[PDB]
Amino acid sequence: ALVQVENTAIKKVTYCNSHINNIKCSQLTANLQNGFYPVASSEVGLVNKSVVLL
Amino acid sequence: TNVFAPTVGGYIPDGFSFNNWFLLTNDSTFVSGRFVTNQPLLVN
Amino acid sequence: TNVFAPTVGGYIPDGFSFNNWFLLTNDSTFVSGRFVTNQPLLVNCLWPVPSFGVAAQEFCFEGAQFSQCNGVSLNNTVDVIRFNLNFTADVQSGMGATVFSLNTTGGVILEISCYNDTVRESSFYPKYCYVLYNGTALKYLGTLPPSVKEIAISKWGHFYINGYNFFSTFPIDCISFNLTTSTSGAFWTIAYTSYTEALVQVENTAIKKVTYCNSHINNIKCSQLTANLQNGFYPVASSEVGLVNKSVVLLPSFYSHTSVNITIDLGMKLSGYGQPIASALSNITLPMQDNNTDVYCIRSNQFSVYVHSTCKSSLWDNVFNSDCTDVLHATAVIKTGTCPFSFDKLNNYLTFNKFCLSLHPVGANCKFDVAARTRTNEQVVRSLYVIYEEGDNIAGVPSDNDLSVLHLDSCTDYNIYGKTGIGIIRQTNSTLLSGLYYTSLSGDLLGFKNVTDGVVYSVTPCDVSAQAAVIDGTIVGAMTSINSELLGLTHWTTTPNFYYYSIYNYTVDCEPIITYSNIGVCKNGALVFINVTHSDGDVQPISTGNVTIPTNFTISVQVEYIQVYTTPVSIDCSRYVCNGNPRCNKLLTQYVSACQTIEQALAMGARLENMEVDSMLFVSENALKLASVEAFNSTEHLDPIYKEWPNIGGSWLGGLKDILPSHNSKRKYRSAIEDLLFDKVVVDEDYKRCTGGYDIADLVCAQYYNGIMVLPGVANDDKMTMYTASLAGGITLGALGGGAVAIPFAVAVQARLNYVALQTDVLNKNQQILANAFNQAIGNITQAFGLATVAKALAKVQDVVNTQGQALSHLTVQLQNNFQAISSSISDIYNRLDPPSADAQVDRLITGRLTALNAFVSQTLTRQAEVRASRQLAKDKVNECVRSQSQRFGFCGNGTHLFSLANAAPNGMIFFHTVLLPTAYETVTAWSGICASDGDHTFGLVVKDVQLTLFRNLDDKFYLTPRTMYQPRVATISDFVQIEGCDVLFVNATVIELPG
Ligand SMILES: *[C@@H]1O[C@H](CO)[C@@H](O[C@@H]2O[C@H](CO)[C@@H](O[C@@H]3O[C@H](CO[C@H]4O[C@H](CO)[C@@H](O)[C@H](O)[C@@H]4O)[C@@H](O)[C@H](O[C@H]4O[C@H](CO)[C@@H](O)[C@H](O)[C@@H]4O)[C@@H]3O)[C@H](O)[C@H]2NC(C)=O)[C@H](O)[C@H]1NC(C)=O
Ligand SMILES: *[C@@H]1O[C@H](CO)[C@@H](O[C@@H]2O[C@H](CO)[C@@H](O[C@@H]3O[C@H](CO)[C@@H](O)[C@H](O[C@H]4O[C@H](CO)[C@@H](O)[C@H](O)[C@@H]4O)[C@@H]3O)[C@H](O)[C@H]2NC(C)=O)[C@H](O)[C@H]1NC(C)=O
Ligand SMILES: *[C@@H]1O[C@H](CO)[C@@H](O[C@@H]2O[C@H](CO)[C@@H](O[C@@H]3O[C@H](CO)[C@@H](O)[C@H](O[C@H]4O[C@H](CO)[C@@H](O)[C@H](O)[C@@H]4O)[C@@H]3O)[C@H](O)[C@H]2NC(C)=O)[C@H](O)[C@H]1NC(C)=O
Ligand SMILES: *[C@@H]1O[C@H](CO)[C@@H](O[C@@H]2O[C@H](CO)[C@@H](O[C@@H]3O[C@H](CO)[C@@H](O)[C@H](O)[C@@H]3O)[C@H](O)[C@H]2NC(C)=O)[C@H](O)[C@H]1NC(C)=O
Ligand SMILES: *[C@@H]1O[C@H](CO)[C@@H](O[C@@H]2O[C@H](CO)[C@@H](O[C@@H]3O[C@H](CO)[C@@H](O)[C@H](O)[C@@H]3O)[C@H](O)[C@H]2NC(C)=O)[C@H](O)[C@H]1NC(C)=O
Ligand SMILES: *[C@@H]1O[C@H](CO)[C@@H](O[C@@H]2O[C@H](CO)[C@@H](O)[C@H](O)[C@H]2NC(C)=O)[C@H](O)[C@H]1NC(C)=O
Ligand SMILES: *[C@@H]1O[C@H](CO)[C@@H](O[C@@H]2O[C@H](CO)[C@@H](O)[C@H](O)[C@H]2NC(C)=O)[C@H](O)[C@H]1NC(C)=O
Ligand SMILES: *[C@@H]1O[C@H](CO)[C@@H](O[C@@H]2O[C@H](CO)[C@@H](O)[C@H](O)[C@H]2NC(C)=O)[C@H](O)[C@H]1NC(C)=O
Ligand SMILES: *[C@@H]1O[C@H](CO)[C@@H](O[C@@H]2O[C@H](CO)[C@@H](O)[C@H](O)[C@H]2NC(C)=O)[C@H](O)[C@H]1NC(C)=O
Ligand SMILES: *[C@@H]1O[C@H](CO)[C@@H](O[C@@H]2O[C@H](CO)[C@@H](O)[C@H](O)[C@H]2NC(C)=O)[C@H](O)[C@H]1NC(C)=O
Ligand SMILES: *[C@@H]1O[C@H](CO)[C@@H](O[C@@H]2O[C@H](CO)[C@@H](O)[C@H](O)[C@H]2NC(C)=O)[C@H](O)[C@H]1NC(C)=O
Ligand SMILES: *[C@@H]1O[C@H](CO)[C@@H](O[C@@H]2O[C@H](CO)[C@@H](O)[C@H](O)[C@H]2NC(C)=O)[C@H](O)[C@H]1NC(C)=O
Ligand SMILES: *[C@@H]1O[C@H](CO)[C@@H](O[C@@H]2O[C@H](CO)[C@@H](O)[C@H](O)[C@H]2NC(C)=O)[C@H](O)[C@H]1NC(C)=O
Ligand SMILES: *[C@@H]1O[C@H](CO)[C@@H](O[C@@H]2O[C@H](CO)[C@@H](O)[C@H](O)[C@H]2NC(C)=O)[C@H](O)[C@H]1NC(C)=O
Ligand SMILES: CCCCCC/C=C\CCCCCCCC(=O)O
Ligand SMILES: CCCCCC/C=C\CCCCCCCC(=O)O
Ligand SMILES: CCCCCC/C=C\CCCCCCCC(=O)O
Ligand SMILES: *[C@@H]1O[C@H](CO)[C@@H](O)[C@H](O)[C@H]1NC(C)=O
Ligand SMILES: *[C@@H]1O[C@H](CO)[C@@H](O)[C@H](O)[C@H]1NC(C)=O
Ligand SMILES: *[C@@H]1O[C@H](CO)[C@@H](O)[C@H](O)[C@H]1NC(C)=O
Ligand SMILES: *[C@@H]1O[C@H](CO)[C@@H](O)[C@H](O)[C@H]1NC(C)=O
Numbered sequence A: 001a002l003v004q005v006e007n008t009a010i011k012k013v014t015y016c017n018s019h020i021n022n023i024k025c026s027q028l029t030a031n032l033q034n035g036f037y038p039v040a041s042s043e044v045g046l047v048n049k050s051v052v053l054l
Numbered sequence B: 001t002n003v004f005a006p007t008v009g010g011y012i013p014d015g016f017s018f019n020n021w022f023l024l025t026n027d028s029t030f031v032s033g034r035f036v037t038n039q040p041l042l043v044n
Numbered sequence C: 001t002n003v004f005a006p007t008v009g010g011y012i013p014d015g016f017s018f019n020n021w022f023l024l025t026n027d028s029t030f031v032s033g034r035f036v037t038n039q040p041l042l043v044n045c046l047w048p049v050p051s052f053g054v055a056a057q058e059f060c061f062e063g064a065q066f067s068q069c070n071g072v073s074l075n076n077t078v079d080v081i082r083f084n085l086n087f088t089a090d091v092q093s094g095m096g097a098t099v100f101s102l103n104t105t106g107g108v109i110l111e112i113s114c115y116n117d118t119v120r121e122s123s124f125y126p127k128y129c130y131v132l133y134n135g136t137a138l139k140y141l142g143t144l145p146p147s148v149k150e151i152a153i154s155k156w157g158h159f160y161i162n163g164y165n166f167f168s169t170f171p172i173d174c175i176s177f178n179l180t181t182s183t184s185g186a187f188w189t190i191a192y193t194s195y196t197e198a199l200v201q202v203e204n205t206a207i208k209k210v211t212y213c214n215s216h217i218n219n220i221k222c223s224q225l226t227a228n229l230q231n232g233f234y235p236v237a238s239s240e241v242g243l244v245n246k247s248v249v250l251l252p253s254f255y256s257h258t259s260v261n262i263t264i265d266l267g268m269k270l271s272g273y274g275q276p277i278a279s280a281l282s283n284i285t286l287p288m289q290d291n292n293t294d295v296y297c298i299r300s301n302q303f304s305v306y307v308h309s310t311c312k313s314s315l316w317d318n319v320f321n322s323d324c325t326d327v328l329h330a331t332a333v334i335k336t337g338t339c340p341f342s343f344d345k346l347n348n349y350l351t352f353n354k355f356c357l358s359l360h361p362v363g364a365n366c367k368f369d370v371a372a373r374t375r376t377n378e379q380v381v382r383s384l385y386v387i388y389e390e391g392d393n394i395a396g397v398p399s400d401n402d403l404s405v406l407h408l409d410s411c412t413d414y415n416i417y418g419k420t421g422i423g424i425i426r427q428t429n430s431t432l433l434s435g436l437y438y439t440s441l442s443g444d445l446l447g448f449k450n451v452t453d454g455v456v457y458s459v460t461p462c463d464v465s466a467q468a469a470v471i472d473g474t475i476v477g478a479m480t481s482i483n484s485e486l487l488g489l490t491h492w493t494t495t496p497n498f499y500y501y502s503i504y505n506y507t508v509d510c511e512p513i514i515t516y517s518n519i520g521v522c523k524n525g526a527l528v529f530i531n532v533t534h535s536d537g538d539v540q541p542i543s544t545g546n547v548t549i550p551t552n553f554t555i556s557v558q559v560e561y562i563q564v565y566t567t568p569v570s571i572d573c574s575r576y577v578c579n580g581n582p583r584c585n586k587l588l589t590q591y592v593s594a595c596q597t598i599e600q601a602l603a604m605g606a607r608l609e610n611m612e613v614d615s616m617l618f619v620s621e622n623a624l625k626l627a628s629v630e631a632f633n634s635t636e637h638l639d640p641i642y643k644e645w646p647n648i649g650g651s652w653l654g655g656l657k658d659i660l661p662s663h664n665s666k667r668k669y670r671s672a673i674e675d676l677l678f679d680k681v682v683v684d685e686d687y688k689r690c691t692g693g694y695d696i697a698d699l700v701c702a703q704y705y706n707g708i709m710v711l712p713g714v715a716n717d718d719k720m721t722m723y724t725a726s727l728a729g730g731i732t733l734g735a736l737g738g739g740a741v742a743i744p745f746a747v748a749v750q751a752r753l754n755y756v757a758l759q760t761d762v763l764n765k766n767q768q769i770l771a772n773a774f775n776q777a778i779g780n781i782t783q784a785f786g787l788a789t790v791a792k793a794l795a796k797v798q799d800v801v802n803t804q805g806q807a808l809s810h811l812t813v814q815l816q817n818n819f820q821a822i823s824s825s826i827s828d829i830y831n832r833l834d835p836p837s838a839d840a841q842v843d844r845l846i847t848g849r850l851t852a853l854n855a856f857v858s859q860t861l862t863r864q865a866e867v868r869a870s871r872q873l874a875k876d877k878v879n880e881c882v883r884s885q886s887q888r889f890g891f892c893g894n895g896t897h898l899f900s901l902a903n904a905a906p907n908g909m910i911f912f913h914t915v916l917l918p919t920a921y922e923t924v925t926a927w928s929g930i931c932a933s934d935g936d937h938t939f940g941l942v943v944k945d946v947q948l949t950l951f952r953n954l955d956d957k958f959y960l961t962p963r964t965m966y967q968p969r970v971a972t973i974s975d976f977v978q979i980e981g982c983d984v985l986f987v988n989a990t991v992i993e994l995p996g
């Protein structure tokens, strides 16, 4: 999560649980200015294995 | 108030005050700023 | 003279010549330059020895016993003894062949004896010099060269002859000598000296000036690598911290202490050459734990470590049954080895979660080195392995006893929760609800919390950075953040941003010498406020009511410097990366692409700037014929219709003689200001001399040897000089298509004045005032070059030259980087390793040098782009201020531009802009128009030229004047435009009283 701290005290906790929240956590801010942001198309997991040898 | 109701997935509502909640550390304590951290904040 | 009298503290006077004094080195000798070095130049006592005199003494270094000292004699220990005499073959010794008798540690006596015949090794008796131990030749030193001028002997056994350490003996306790000479002029000196830090200037391997860093101003001089400091601000430290208490803060714990004693039994033998050899059969005993004495783990909360050593002797049979004698006596020590901590620092409040000492290598994180230290050497005999885990449960303490001691409101060395430093610890009122301690972004401790009551303490540095103001080589003030005295200053004043200490009497109207922003420092140290510049204001295009027009004009000259070109460099990438080594070239054949990219970038940059510069410069033959002081001082080229004028220069020549080229110049077409700027701010570009080998190569030849070629630039300077001369001479060229017909400079100035404003006073003209103002301004500028604009121009040229030099200096010095290799020399690597092992070493050097070249190329390209923009600005300035008069307001300097001249400067040019400065205003009643009435027909008249102001004279006649200069003229009907309506601000008039 992205946590804001003032005088060693938590003020705001943004969880990186959605795509927009992922962008917010990547930009280190919970208020995003209008614009274009680089992201990943998707996430890869649980794939098969291929082995090719001589 | 110190009592909050966890949303779906166990996330603290944005209206909380964190009066008795701190950041866990093994070193020095951040005084001010914004940090992306892995903290025990998923309230089951 | 060779005799000097030491000042207070033992410092050599500034008037010395250092005829027989050299810099001591273990390597190569600096040929020229300034260096901050720790050298034995603190003269405690100087014994002068006259001609035919005898100097006989036995000196112990821990015994400042002295015989004769011309001057005060110090009471400190002596480190080096120097004999400054011509040690030729005509110097007699009272001990016979022996010149020096050395008593070393342990009572061993060594002699330095010269003989007239060669002595074989381990035997007994042009001069051949030897080191004798017991009457036998131990070391051959060589024949005495004819040019020995100083012999320096250090207490650690090193001998320096003419500055170079040629041999080292054992550490010496006492030195007996007995010398006499007759050809040593009048006096030769024996100096007892101690090491000190100083800035030394060296020219041709000879000392010229020694500045000791013994005062605050001398500290600044040593920091700036110069003994002449320019006026300005320099960063310094507020004070120095020493002899402070210690504070330790740790988490609460039980107090149980364990003493760990390591017993080391060393075995020693005598080798065949008499050297004490420590046996590997030495034994290590740890405290007993679980029936074992080979592994010991700390099981308490606090511990201390101690070592006990015993010594035994053997007879080459490993049977230790005797007691170590004086030669074979050794003491056991423990050295760091590969561990991240030292054994002697374990009792320095180091914290662990687990700490075990073992005699077996398995499972160990690191190992210590157990060594035996003799009177001469130190030999490793065993290994003690350490298994440790980082944490805070177990702490090493100096001794058995609360460990929490805190000193407040004073400088102290603190160890708080594992963080160590020097600082002042204070108690604050703040309440931070989280954490134990706090650090800054750089990792420095800022505050910590007491775990008993929750009080937060802050930590600040003991000393802070300050700014010292230096004017005329003395400290007159200091800006600081602490209200404490510093740098010898006592009086102080308070500023909203800092404290200012000064030599001025603080419980001011003065001209500030050094200024920044709104802060100024005067010569007497007073602090003054610098406000923004004030001016009367800009003339407004108003033609209604009472308006002011500038009338009385003087001449102001403003100087501006603009850079036009850089100093281009060609680099041979292969020669820079590989110093001609064929194997390195074969390796670099795999990186050839990087070298190609570097060369292509540099060559393209140079070609583009040459193309840019080529299209900018031009000359005219007829203009160059008139461009000289001699031509302006004669009437040979004047048109016969100017017979009244004595010459071209006229009254302006007094100012033009410093700008135009003259025959009294070092180079062709060179003027006085150009010579001053090329000599007061700034060599040989012949490459044929570098390969001659007739002397030691200089910096430029060495850089060439490294593959760094500075391209020719004298031609560009000559082209710029001829360009500026032709521009200056074209002002007075009457016609273009024929010969060199000239007009007086006054006529050209009058044409420029008419361009500024149409001159209506043909008879009463005063150009003498303008010429005198111009002459005085040029004289002041010339004096200043050998006036803020002149200072700014000088600073700009100096900065350009310094940056250009440093860019190449950094690249050249990058060749001594090892880049994590055994050596920075490729030939050295290939002379010590097999090619398979040497290629890996050479690869690192190749990569590092390629990275350095890439950085240099990037910086060069950025500089070139900046200079390209500057060159565009300079071209605009030449076109719109020198070759014409620009209509742009304020472009050619502050004021009404009249004309500009140009001269060549290092890497660019300087412009003299001549402007009109008003000294008075005329007030007139201006009208925006005339409402003319002719009975029933009423119509308005407006001024056709919007840049003219219409007013009325005393005789009720309408006049027009420009607003740049007050040049009134009678208005005519052709100067007006007729319109239907009238404005309220118009002046009423009849048809009879209209102009024209
Ligand atoms: C661009 O170029 C213009 C000139 O073309 C500069 O303008 C001049 O700037 C100077 C400096 O500010 C001005 O000079 C000052 O004028 C003040 C007014 O003078 C009164 O007294 C004189 C007496 O002879 C009268 O003639 C005048 O009418 C006024 O009644 C002076 O008070 C100033 O005195 C300075 O020296 C004294 C003695 O040390 C100090 O006590 C003062 O504090 C002060 O430092 C000063 O002489 C000048 O008037 C301006 N001229 C014009 C035409 O505007 C611009 O400043 C320059 N711009 C830049 C950015 O450089
Ligand atoms: C201060 O330092 C201590 C160590 O000195 C550190 O404690 C560490 O905590 C992490 C968790 O935050 C532990 O990591 C785990 O490792 C075990 C292996 O023994 C794994 O099984 C765990 O993984 C699973 O569990 C997670 C929780 O359910 C899942 O999210 C995860 O996907 C896996 O399913 C886990 O990664 C680690 O072992 C200790 N280290 C120790 C005990 O030495 C502590 O976090 C530090 N405190 C800080 C940084 O605030
Ligand atoms: C050439 O290299 C040699 C070494 O091969 C080098 O000799 C070194 O000289 C320095 C002094 O210049 C010696 O350093 C000393 O170390 C001893 C420990 O044995 C210290 O006790 C000394 O410190 C005290 O003494 C100083 C003088 O009174 C004080 O100023 C100081 O504050 C201390 O009180 C001292 O630091 C060093 O041991 C030798 N090295 C040896 C003998 O191996 C020599 O300097 C080099 N020559 C150059 C660089 O011109
Ligand atoms: C490049 O062009 C410049 C400018 O046109 C040339 O300058 C000219 O140089 C010559 C040779 O020095 C000068 O002629 C000689 O001058 C001396 C003066 O003492 C005199 O003794 C000779 O009778 C002769 O006139 C010439 O005046 C000069 N021209 C100008 C306009 O200043 C320059 O030579 C050219 N360079 C080359 C390599 O061609
Ligand atoms: C730098 O510029 C200043 C500008 O003032 C020059 O000072 C001026 O110099 C001239 C020529 O020497 C002085 O003229 C003389 O004035 C006296 C007094 O009226 C008179 O008796 C002489 O017959 C002569 O006319 C002028 O007064 C003087 N001005 C001031 C204010 O001092 C100075 O010379 C320039 N410096 C250089 C190196 O050119
Ligand atoms: C230093 O050497 C000189 C000679 O250069 C020594 O003076 C000699 O002393 C011996 C012994 O008394 C005499 O027999 C000689 O006649 C002396 N020679 C001269 C020329 O005077 C002197 O003693 C030595 N000084 C010492 C060792 O301190
Ligand atoms: C060389 O120095 C040694 C060590 O200082 C001198 O030997 C000392 O001589 C004095 C004479 O009174 C004795 O008291 C010391 O006990 C001796 N020290 C040792 C370790 O034996 C020796 O005399 C010197 N040699 C000379 C000056 O020629
Ligand atoms: C060593 O000899 C040199 C000459 O070889 C002496 O230096 C010369 O001193 C005389 C007398 O003052 C000067 O006239 C010469 O110009 C000097 N020559 C130079 C500086 O090269 C030097 O004084 C002698 N040194 C000692 C200690 O006697
Ligand atoms: C270190 O300890 C070993 C083992 O006790 C010692 O070696 C023994 O020395 C004694 C006395 O000379 C001999 O009788 C034994 O035969 C030796 N044993 C072995 C295995 O060689 C050794 O002397 C000690 N080293 C010291 C004290 O420096
Ligand atoms: C942390 O605070 C405690 C509590 O104030 C300090 O302990 C006090 O020490 C003073 C001076 O010796 C005693 O007079 C008090 O009685 C103590 N109070 C207690 C024990 O409750 C302690 O010194 C502080 N720690 C540091 C490192 O300053
Ligand atoms: C412009 O200034 C002039 C003076 O330079 C002013 O004329 C004077 O005005 C005063 C005030 O009314 C009279 O007492 C004087 O007799 C006038 N002098 C002359 C010679 O006429 C004039 O009023 C100003 N003009 C404006 C438009 O403000
Ligand atoms: C311009 O030429 C004149 C005339 O030759 C120079 O004035 C002469 O200067 C010399 C010294 O160089 C004096 O001895 C003469 O008496 C001067 N003659 C006069 C004043 O008639 C003048 O210096 C030259 N100006 C320059 C070169 O700027
Ligand atoms: C411009 O300068 C001229 C020349 O100095 C000034 O005219 C002189 O001013 C002085 C000082 O008041 C008088 O004594 C003279 O009688 C004036 N001479 C003439 C011919 O008028 C003039 O005042 C200045 N201009 C302004 C607007 O102040
Ligand atoms: C020029 O003359 C005209 C015409 O008389 C003036 O305009 C008059 O202004 C007064 C006030 O000053 C008004 O009461 C009248 O009604 C205006 N008359 C008209 C016909 O509009 C004007 O003021 C005069 N201008 C100057 C500068 O004196
Ligand atoms: C798959 C790649 C597609 C590329 C499409 C490019 C479209 C948008 C990129 C905009 C980036 C320009 C910088 C401005 C970013 C901003 O406004 O915050
Ligand atoms: C405790 C900090 C106080 C800061 C006060 C700043 C005053 C002077 C700094 C001047 C530095 C500007 C650069 C120019 C230096 C120079 O002229 O040599
Ligand atoms: C399980 C019962 C409580 C645990 C007791 C631990 C003992 C000492 C506490 C040490 C930590 C002190 C932290 C300071 C807290 C603060 O003042 O903000
Ligand atoms: C892996 O391959 C199998 C068939 O061999 C397929 O059924 C399965 O979906 C694959 N898994 C993936 C793509 O994650
Ligand atoms: C050295 O001098 C001695 C004494 O005069 C002499 O006997 C000897 O032959 C000399 N040696 C040489 C090589 O000249
Ligand atoms: C030194 O030489 C002398 C003279 O031969 C001899 O008696 C003495 O034993 C020697 N000393 C040493 C330590 O060899
Ligand atoms: C250390 O503290 C003692 C008192 O415990 C004090 O007398 C002494 O001056 C201090 N030393 C310093 C500040 O250097």
Ligand SMILES: *[C@@H]1O[C@H](CO)[C@@H](O)[C@H](O)[C@H]1NC(C)=O
Pocket (backbone or CB within 6 Å): C259, C260, C261, C306
């Ligand atoms: C360890 O050595 C110390 C001295 O350093 C001594 O006082 C102590 O008694 C020793 N402990 C033992 C031998 O257990």
Ligand SMILES: *[C@@H]1O[C@H](CO)[C@@H](O)[C@H](O)[C@H]1NC(C)=O
Pocket (backbone or CB within 6 Å): C505, C507
């Ligand atoms: C500074 O001036 C005061 C009076 O303002 C005077 O008493 C004092 O002695 C002076 N201090 C010096 C000159 O150091």
